Amino acid sequence: QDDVAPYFKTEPGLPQIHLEGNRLVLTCLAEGSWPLEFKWIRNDSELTTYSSEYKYIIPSLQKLDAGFYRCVVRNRMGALLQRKSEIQVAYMGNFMDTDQRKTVSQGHAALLNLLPIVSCPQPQVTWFREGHKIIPSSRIAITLENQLVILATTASDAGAYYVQAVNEKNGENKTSPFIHLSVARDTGTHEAMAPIIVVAPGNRSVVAGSSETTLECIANARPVEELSVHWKRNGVRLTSGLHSYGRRLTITNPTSADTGMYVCEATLRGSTFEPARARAFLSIIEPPYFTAEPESRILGEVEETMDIPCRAMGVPLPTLQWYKDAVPLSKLQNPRYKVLPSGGLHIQKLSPEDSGIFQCFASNEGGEVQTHTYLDVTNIAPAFTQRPVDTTVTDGMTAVLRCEVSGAPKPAITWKRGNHILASGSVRIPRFMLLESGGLRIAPVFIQDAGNYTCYAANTEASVNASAMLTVWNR
Amino acid sequence: QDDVAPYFKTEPGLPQIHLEGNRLVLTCLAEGSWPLEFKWIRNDSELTTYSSEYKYIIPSLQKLDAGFYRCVVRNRMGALLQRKSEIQVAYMGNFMDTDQRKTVSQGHAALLNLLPIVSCPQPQVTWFREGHKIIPSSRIAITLENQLVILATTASDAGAYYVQAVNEKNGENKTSPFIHLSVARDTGTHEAMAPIIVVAPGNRSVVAGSSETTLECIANARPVEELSVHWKRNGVRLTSGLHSYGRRLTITNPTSADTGMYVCEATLRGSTFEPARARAFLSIIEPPYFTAEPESRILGEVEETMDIPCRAMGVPLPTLQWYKDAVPLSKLQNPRYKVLPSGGLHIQKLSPEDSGIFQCFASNEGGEVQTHTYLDVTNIAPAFTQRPVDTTVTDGMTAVLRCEVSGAPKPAITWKRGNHILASGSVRIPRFMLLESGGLRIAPVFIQDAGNYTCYAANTEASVNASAMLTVWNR
Ligand SMILES: *[C@@H]1O[C@H](CO)[C@@H](O[C@@H]2O[C@H](CO)[C@@H](O)[C@H](O)[C@H]2NC(C)=O)[C@H](O)[C@H]1NC(C)=O
Ligand SMILES: *[C@@H]1O[C@H](CO)[C@@H](O[C@@H]2O[C@H](CO)[C@@H](O)[C@H](O)[C@H]2NC(C)=O)[C@H](O)[C@H]1NC(C)=O
Ligand SMILES: *[C@@H]1O[C@H](CO[C@@H]2O[C@@H](C)[C@@H](O)[C@@H](O)[C@@H]2O)[C@@H](O)[C@H](O)[C@H]1NC(C)=O
Ligand SMILES: *[C@@H]1O[C@H](CO[C@@H]2O[C@@H](C)[C@@H](O)[C@@H](O)[C@@H]2O)[C@@H](O)[C@H](O)[C@H]1NC(C)=O
Ligand SMILES: *[C@@H]1O[C@H](CO)[C@@H](O)[C@H](O)[C@H]1NC(C)=O
Ligand SMILES: *[C@@H]1O[C@H](CO)[C@@H](O)[C@H](O)[C@H]1NC(C)=O
Ligand SMILES: *[C@@H]1O[C@H](CO)[C@@H](O)[C@H](O)[C@H]1NC(C)=O
Ligand SMILES: *[C@@H]1O[C@H](CO)[C@@H](O)[C@H](O)[C@H]1NC(C)=O
Ligand SMILES: *[C@@H]1O[C@H](CO)[C@@H](O)[C@H](O)[C@H]1NC(C)=O
């Protein structure tokens, strides 16, 4: 054909991470009636101008190039916007070069946080004390946030700790300065410490279909030998998916049946102490999907009212965003564009400048989907659905001549007899000659009203005339 | 820190396509008792030897360097094999440099296949005829396989066609040679043509969780205006997800409820011709998951029988392969290693050589998963559960001296009185002096049997002796 609006051949894939210093080539593959132009956008900011270059090449990736990219295609018809593509860049910074200090009273839990370091993705850490690798045991844990946890600390736990971090994507590794941990011997060598949850499980929301999800719970008590950390769901202790001395519970292939509350509980076996409990909540995000899409192309008559359907579902409920030619309707500030609460678009009076691509985006916390349509608004020249015919009407009785025309917008109809005008939209005021929808009615009719009449229906595009002779018979 | 078998901190992620000439960094991030060593494998072939370097770096990635990579971690305890990672390289070759010719009779469908070109991934195409971009219409379609299909060809459709292919990953573009198409005018301009399916929909198997899938169906008829191609499933025409003049049916978020058969049908609206039909079948692959995993560490006594659980479900049913220290049990040809049909491992008699990591892999047509355990086979020194006690027994009656021990392997028990050995595993013959399991029974007992007795239990590790006095009373 010779009048095709743009449409994409292929949409962006899943987000991806790339190494610093590598070459990146984004492509914008769309088809449509020429001349096609492409503009590139990063983070809702225009990067390039429109050109015949559908590619975008970064010869050496930096960390600042990371973000969300998307392409815009445009020809004479309209503009279409590509879905987001998430380009991440792998980097790892350096530790602040200064030692730190921390003090813990004897028996309490010692929690050493990973010293600040910017890294993408999260680095894998290996903790060290006096040159010896610290491997987790019943008394030592390494939380998911790379924090070291020493349970039931004694005087022998004092010393200088440090960590060695490795970024699993670029292989870079950095060694931190020291954290000097000191233990105060005030609590005593012999006592009993009620179980206390040091690291509680947190609420989690998982996109439906993910491989696995993990929960953690660290607790402190003394004697640590008798400390038991267990997971309850639906009032029953769980046994499957447990890791790291019962401190980690993993849901493999989580589904809607796994949502709800999980309860971490720590008890000191054989003690009169009340247990420690912490609640966590698993929910699942359903990425959006359309239940109502508009047809690909939509024809419209001017001055008409248009409704473009767009409804989408998801968990949580998706949000709809309307664009016209890659411009959000919000910034267009067109008062005639009203967005229905269902999500559909409502256009009051169609004007020729409303032609172009309309786009609907459904967004969740875990997805985004797009639909679009081409709106074609054209003018219709006036035409006669039924022309007036010659008629004979008895004196004193009413007479009606029909002159029905179709046009966009509605043609202005003017009934005139020879050189004088009898009725119009502006003028329907003399001798009870009435203009009704589609025609003229004279009531009553004298012989002085006899003669031939002409109906002039005019539009912004053209004008048309229809003649018909009326003869008045004697009473 | 000693006594900790290896285990990975992170496993490889989903496959990604990389550009030619980019830097590639694979990491083998595992923790465990030092000294740790690492080896690298590509396609069942070692790349590196064992060393203290956990990284593998390709400064300039080439097409030939594509393949499957994995690392093996090893310390004094055993060896552990990482999940394979798929390294794909984006490339785009050229077309075979020669023109081709094709002929179609006026009214038939003309199917032009994309000329041969090797490219990863599959290139997007734009079709041209005499320097004009061919845009799909009701009469012209571009298949999912980049084929151009012209329905109801006329003499005005003859000419030289060519395609321009673009690789969406690296942006390269190549232009094919010419297909000189001629249209024979034998059948005639004035006639009707029955709907005939040209491009049939293909069977599709899709891994569960994929975004979308699409069947295509292209049919030819004349007049092409009256040709309607629609999709029926379960005897009902589908209205959701129709694309490109009804020729494309797209299942969005395909789940188990979407599997089965789909039927394409093409009719000439208002004709006495029978409709044309074509069946297609959609199935869904469920990646493997474990339903039974072994414990992280398993302690075992020598000469005993061991069973290691490994079950895994999925669609299709997964295949399970076993390894011992990164060596497949099939290659080991060990007769004491029997693989259960449920997937479990069965070890007949535990020998100290059986110590080390065992690793179960579950793989299907759409995934692979890993579980492992460390088997520690040790010897247990003999220890008395109950030593012999002083006893007084009436002459003629039976008597029992109890000497029960625990050890691995089973301690050989030798019952001796003074310098003479009354009973042993080798000798249990004399005077109905019988060796009960863990004890000595004299039946009957004469006055000559009085005195104190000693029990000698010995394994390969050590030997222990225990004595007790026996006094016989007169009848
Ligand atoms: C473009 O937007 C992305 C996403 O909002 C930004 O990426 C974030 O960067 C900040 C700091 O650099 C991090 O704390 C976030 O974790 C990143 N991701 C997200 C999802 O927020 C990126 O920085 C933006 N680029 C520019 C130039 O503003
Ligand atoms: C490693 O093996 C893989 C497959 O076992 C090879 O990749 C295949 O190569 C053949 C022919 O070169 C292609 O037809 C397949 O499409 C490839 N499959 C892929 C890429 O998944 C690979 O070439 C081997 N490695 C090396 C270095 O040759
Ligand atoms: C954790 O969530 C509780 C309930 O909130 C809802 O349910 C869980 C599954 C979450 O997914 C959350 O997004 C939902 O809104 C709250 O009662 C509780 O306060 C939350 N805890 C927090 C926010 O720290
Ligand atoms: C299409 O498939 C039919 C059924 O086979 C099953 O479904 C397909 C989708 C595959 O997943 C296959 O592994 C399954 O066994 C076949 O009976 C039929 O012959 C196939 N037809 C063609 C043209 O391949
Ligand atoms: C990275 O690891 C190596 C291996 O031990 C080590 O020698 C080197 O010091 C580490 N780099 C840093 C910056 O600590
Ligand atoms: C209407 O009047 C104009 C002007 O006289 C004339 O050109 C036109 O032909 C008339 N319409 C028809 C249908 O004849
Ligand atoms: C094809 O590639 C050439 C150079 O590689 C480039 O100049 C041109 O713009 C590309 N596109 C077309 C349509 O030729
Ligand atoms: C065992 O018997 C011998 C001789 O019959 C005797 O000398 C010895 O004291 C006895 N053992 C004990 C522990 O009395
Ligand atoms: C008997 O046991 C003792 C004590 O365990 C040990 O010293 C001795 O070597 C054993 N054997 C003999 C023959 O005394």
Numbering used by the authors:
A (entry chain B), B (entry chain A): 1 to 475
Please share excerpts from the published article on this structure.
Sdk1 and Sdk2 are single-pass transmembrane proteins, with extracellular regions composed of 6 N-terminal immunoglobulin (Ig) domains followed by 13 fibronectin type III (FNIII) domains, and a relatively short intracellular domain terminating in a Postsynaptic density/Discs Large/ZO-1 (PDZ) binding motif. Here, we report the crystal structures of cell-cell adhesive homophilic dimers of mouse Sdk1 and Sdk2, each mediated by the four N-terminal Ig domains. These four domains adopt a horseshoe conformation, like many other IgSF cell-cell recognition proteins, but they interact in a unique back-to-back anti-parallel manner not previously observed.
The Sdk1Ig1–5 structure showed that Ig5 extends laterally from the horseshoe with a 54° deviation from linearity with Ig4. This angle is maintained in both independent Ig1–5 chains observed in the crystal structure. The linker between Ig4 and Ig5 is only one amino acid (N379) and there is a small Ig4:Ig5 interface with a buried surface area (BSA) over both domains of ~370 Å2. This interface—involving the linker region, the Ig4 AB loop and the Ig5 BC loop—likely provides rigidity to the Ig4–Ig5 junction. (A) Surface view of the Sdk1Ig1–5 structure showing the back-to-back horseshoe-mediated dimer observed in the crystal structure. The positioning of Ig6 is therefore unknown, however, since Ig5 projects away from the dimer interface it is unlikely Ig6 would be able to contribute to the dimer observed in the crystal structures, which is described in detail below. (G) Our data suggest Sdk dimerizes using the crystallographically-determined interface, both between molecules emanating from opposing cell surfaces (in trans)—mediating cell-cell interactions—and between molecules emanating from the same cell surface (in cis)—mediating Sdk clustering. These interactions are shown schematically, using the Sdk1Ig1–5 crystal structure to illustrate the dimer interaction.
